[PDB]
Amino acid sequence: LFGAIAGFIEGGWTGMVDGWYGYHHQNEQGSGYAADLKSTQNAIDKITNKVNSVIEKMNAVGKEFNHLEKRIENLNKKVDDGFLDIWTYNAELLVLLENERTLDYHDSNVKNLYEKVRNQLKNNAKEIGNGCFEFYHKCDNTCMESVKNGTYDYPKYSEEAKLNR
Amino acid sequence: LFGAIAGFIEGGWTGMVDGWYGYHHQNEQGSGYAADLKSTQNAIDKITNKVNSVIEKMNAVGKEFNHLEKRIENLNKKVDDGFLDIWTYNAELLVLLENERTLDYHDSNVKNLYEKVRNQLKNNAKEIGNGCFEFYHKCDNTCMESVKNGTYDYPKYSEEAKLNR
Amino acid sequence: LFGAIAGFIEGGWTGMVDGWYGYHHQNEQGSGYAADLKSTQNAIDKITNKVNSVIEKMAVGKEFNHLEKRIENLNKKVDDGFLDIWTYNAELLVLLENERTLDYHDSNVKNLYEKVRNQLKNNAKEIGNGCFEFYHKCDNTCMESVKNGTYDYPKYSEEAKLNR
Amino acid sequence: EKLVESGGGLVQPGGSLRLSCVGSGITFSSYVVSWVRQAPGKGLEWLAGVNTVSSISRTDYADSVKGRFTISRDDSQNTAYLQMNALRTEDTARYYCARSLYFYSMRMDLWGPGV
Amino acid sequence: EKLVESGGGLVQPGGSLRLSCVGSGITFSSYVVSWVRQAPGKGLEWLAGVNTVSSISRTDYADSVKGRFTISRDDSQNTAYLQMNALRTEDTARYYCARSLYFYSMRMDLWGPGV
Amino acid sequence: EKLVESGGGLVQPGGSLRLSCVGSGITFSSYVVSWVRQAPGKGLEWLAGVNTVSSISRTDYADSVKGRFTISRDDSQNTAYLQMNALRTEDTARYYCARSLYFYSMRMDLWGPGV
Amino acid sequence: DTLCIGYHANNSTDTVDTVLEKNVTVTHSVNLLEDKHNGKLCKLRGVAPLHLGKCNIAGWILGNPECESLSTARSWSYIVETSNSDNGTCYPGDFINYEELREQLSSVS
Amino acid sequence: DCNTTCQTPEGAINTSLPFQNVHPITIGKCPKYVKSTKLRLATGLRNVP
Amino acid sequence: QLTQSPASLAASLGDTVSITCRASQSISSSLAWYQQQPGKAPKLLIYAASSLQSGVPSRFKGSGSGTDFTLTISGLQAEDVASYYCLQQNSAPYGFGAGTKLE
Amino acid sequence: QLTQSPASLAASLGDTVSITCRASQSISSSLAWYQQQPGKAPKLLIYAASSLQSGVPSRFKGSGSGTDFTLTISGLQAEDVASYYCLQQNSAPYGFGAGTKLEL
Amino acid sequence: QLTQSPASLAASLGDTVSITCRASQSISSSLAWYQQQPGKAPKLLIYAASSLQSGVPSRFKGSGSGTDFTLTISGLQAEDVASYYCLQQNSAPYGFGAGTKLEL
């Protein structure tokens, strides 16, 4: 586990209806949620591929024996029961392992998004701890757009942040 | 792998005996060990569930043939050996994978504990690098109780820790 | 997934022919690549053990006359069932082990980055693509010291402090 | 993966129709299903959209068909229904069902042949 | 899972008695077994506790029964033993075995019916 | 887990001789194979080295045998070849093959018996 | 000015099982098990089955008097026998390799 | 009267799911029979509202 | 070491009940509350001084960190008439409280 | 909401073609470009205003943000003669562009 | 160019033996130490200049980085009477040391 979905981010956002991972921003010109479309799309593609692989990995009547072929009848019952047990075991194990791996994958996505946002602002923001960053300068909508897209400008706001720090 | 159990923390503590993961403090009031009980309890519950799931997934005599049923005897032997091989393989593989998953789970727990303490102390302490922080302020047992609980008061010591930094 | 191999380090170095993970340094005495031999050797040993574990964990027909169709069908059922089970096992094992191996390499790179970060601390600036730019003059002795794990932080403390 | 449309044909003005979009596969509850139409000589027009059963905004309609058209879903039968009422001559068009996955911001890259 | 106590009954004063606590399952070496007793008209009283085999402190006893009672463990037979020596009249009580998992700081939530 | 050398013997001065090192296993494409000779009375001498197929520096030689010797690889047949040309009397020695896994920086810990 | 990183939540109440924990409520899930049937015998690829109502394969093959309804039977998708199919070899005796005949008639269209 | 691709003694199955727990005996293209009662594969995140 | 108060307490249905435990020294959150009915094994209610055991109704709550601990029963019901004990799990000679009887 | 500028175009083989879309309000890289041939279902070319759909030749490039977006076809081929549409996927009533017809 | 210092040394049982290698250039901890008995394949003792190969007794210790390297045998035993070689694994033409013969 990466300690983000139930970790330092303690809850999910019902108001974020555009993706799986995203941001919530609070400026002087309004608030709102906005999903990270690249991460969500990559995750959707990978999970769809996972489901397809699971279903494509898998890819029948009874016989009659009279009273003098009880051994063959027991052999047939043994074969059927053994194959049934093996396939049931395989199905349950596959589902159980894949569910854990999928949940870990989503947690990793959230953690990596947090790290990429943190590596941009650097000294210009305070890490509150609950997944929020509090800027030391005036982040308008252009500043937020730059942080989301990945083209934030530390030299540009560094002086104001230094003054307010 | 999260690089904590054999990583930046290079050794286990035999002193720790109240839990799996935990803390060691060195105040002016004395030294001590103290386990993180919430993490340990959660880990114990999850691993007990893991062992029970491994158990719950798993849950005859021979037949005699005369000399004119060598084909059916060979079929019976083939069925028995095939099932034996499949089940041996399944048991070995399940144990081998589950062991790695358990060890990575413990590593993740230790790293998450380190992350949680770091995101709480911030600049009021200094990362020595071996697993510990040297506080820039002289704060007593109430301090470390607060850090362990998760109710640390950064503004309370922010000024005091600034002169020594 | 640890977000290093395709993450904040966006490309692999084709000019580092010494190991799997390593360093690229640029001082005044020159540039160059140097692999981390300890991590690469450990990774190689572990992958060799993984492959061995995979390999060490892993017959003619019968004839029936026309009045023995049932046992013939039973034999065909046994053969086909075992074939399906073993094919499923092989594909599943390969599919899972590939994920685990790739995640293992990603974790190795991320741990190396974190280890280098935890030494230089505030004596260097994190660019964000994997590189640290020093606030002091690090010679080849400085670079080796960082690679070894014996970086002398107090030595280059004030000199870095003035430039930062 | 395929999407097939059915339930079209000739309608008297003022009448009603129900179009059905049937999906092939097992992951239909993940589909966010949109209905588009093209008039004979005009461009693509987005009409209605039905969202997943666990969402907040379940249905969306264009202003040109709001109150006349209703969108609905049946995950058990793998079908999305478009019920059109008070049909007009301007509604003579080819109707297409398209699908995005999980959200309306994702790619709408699986279209039906039309009807 | 479950814990069953056995080996009680009547003992003359000055006598000895060995009580056994047997657990069902495969995870018994994880158990941290403790003995509690309830005298008629008194409250619960913790007597002794046996730790896991790979631990520093192996046994621990209450001051009232220290030197008279001896706790022991047999993981192969899935049993924990309490040997009581020099029995007094005040030792007449219902004896219970509870278990915590791995550590004594964890939940002691599996109790036996008692003898 | 084994490397076997073959192809040695008697050769006239000025002749040619090809030695082969064959490996047992499935991971031969990983090997970075190397040849080391030991002249009777003299010490160990690193002669040639073939790298993996996907590498940049595919082949390296010592200065003593550069131009006369040629190392080569065949992963399909699990073999590394050393072609010696213009053989001299000073080349009478014992030839060993060693592997160092993926890079020449790793352990060269699998030696063949010699030839 | 604040910017927080978060993830999606919704009204879904569907649950999955994991090795470490059970009954995990998740946002989205797919079902891999079918437990529903229409409770009817039905044509396979448009071909109706051959229903031996009161007869068995012995009675149908031999032409039991209580099986005249089964004399006109050209093609079928599968054969259906009932649990109370008693009408068979009406005259006492033994059907030799009866099970072999049943096996050969299970590959006959 | 029907048109199905999978027939069991208990009734026909109209599904494309990989598994079933209806009946072992099948005719046609049918899903694999297992003794399980719940096989759900997670796609989305853990729901923490 | 562990002082439990009051020894007995009579309350009516629907009321709120507080049972207090005081420790001689500082035990950090290592307290458990057990409900026992006559002649039966004790049943755990709250562990870690604040954690509610699975299957226990949310009427029971626990509080306290160092030396003062409280068990609160909100909305007393007829099935809550039992004895209540407090257990420490910190110092090597582990022990119970005196016990509180609820009527 | 969405205005597609050319509404008609005549380009020769091998030329470079630019089709621009302008939005009434910022939609933040939620614009997709589709190619439709007469009587056939639309085919997705560009999503997220810059991402190339799998199987689509690299002659197609999308670029834009906010209110202005452009689709560039470099090295026009004979199979690129069709209609092109822009879809916005941001606001609750979703919509297309008016349509641009590419001719020789 | 690797220079092996002693080139011959006589030592008794239980004594401590030091073998020194010097490099013309700087090779960052890319030295290996091999033990050879006559007419047999060499056996790795030390790799990375300080790492002990599995199965090798702890009597063998390696030290040094840069240009100076040392192999120390503490508690010499009769099975340690053999030749010792140093392999450099840094520069493109790899090579061994001259060879040190350990005698009694």
Coordinates of C-alpha atoms in Angstrom, one line a residue, chain K residues 51-103:
Chain K
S51 CA 32.0 -8.1 -0.9
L52 CA 32.5 -11.7 0.2
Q53 CA 31.3 -14.5 -2.2
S54 CA 28.9 -16.9 -0.8
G55 CA 30.6 -20.0 0.6
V56 CA 33.9 -18.3 1.2
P57 CA 35.1 -18.3 4.8
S58 CA 35.2 -15.0 6.7
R59 CA 39.0 -15.2 7.0
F60 CA 39.2 -13.4 3.7
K61 CA 38.6 -9.7 3.8
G62 CA 38.9 -7.1 1.0
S63 CA 39.4 -3.4 1.4
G64 CA 40.3 -0.3 -0.6
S65 CA 38.9 2.0 -3.2
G66 CA 40.4 4.1 -6.0
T67 CA 43.9 2.9 -6.9
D68 CA 44.9 0.9 -3.8
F69 CA 43.3 -2.4 -2.8
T70 CA 44.1 -5.0 -0.1
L71 CA 43.2 -8.6 0.5
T72 CA 43.7 -9.8 4.0
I73 CA 43.8 -13.4 5.1
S74 CA 43.4 -13.6 8.9
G75 CA 44.0 -17.0 10.4
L76 CA 45.8 -18.7 7.5
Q77 CA 45.0 -22.3 7.1
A78 CA 46.6 -25.1 5.0
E79 CA 43.8 -24.9 2.4
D80 CA 44.8 -21.2 1.8
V81 CA 48.1 -22.2 0.1
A82 CA 47.4 -21.2 -3.5
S83 CA 47.9 -18.4 -6.0
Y84 CA 45.9 -15.1 -5.8
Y85 CA 44.9 -12.9 -8.7
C86 CA 43.3 -9.5 -8.9
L87 CA 40.9 -8.8 -11.8
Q88 CA 40.0 -5.3 -12.9
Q89 CA 36.5 -4.9 -14.3
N90 CA 36.4 -1.2 -15.2
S91 CA 38.2 -0.3 -18.5
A92 CA 37.4 -1.9 -21.9
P93 CA 40.5 -4.3 -22.0
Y94 CA 40.1 -6.2 -18.8
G95 CA 43.1 -7.8 -17.1
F96 CA 44.5 -9.7 -14.1
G97 CA 47.4 -9.0 -11.8
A98 CA 50.8 -10.6 -12.1
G99 CA 50.0 -13.2 -9.5
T100 CA 50.9 -13.8 -5.9
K101 CA 52.1 -17.2 -4.8
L102 CA 51.4 -18.0 -1.1
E103 CA 53.8 -20.5 0.4

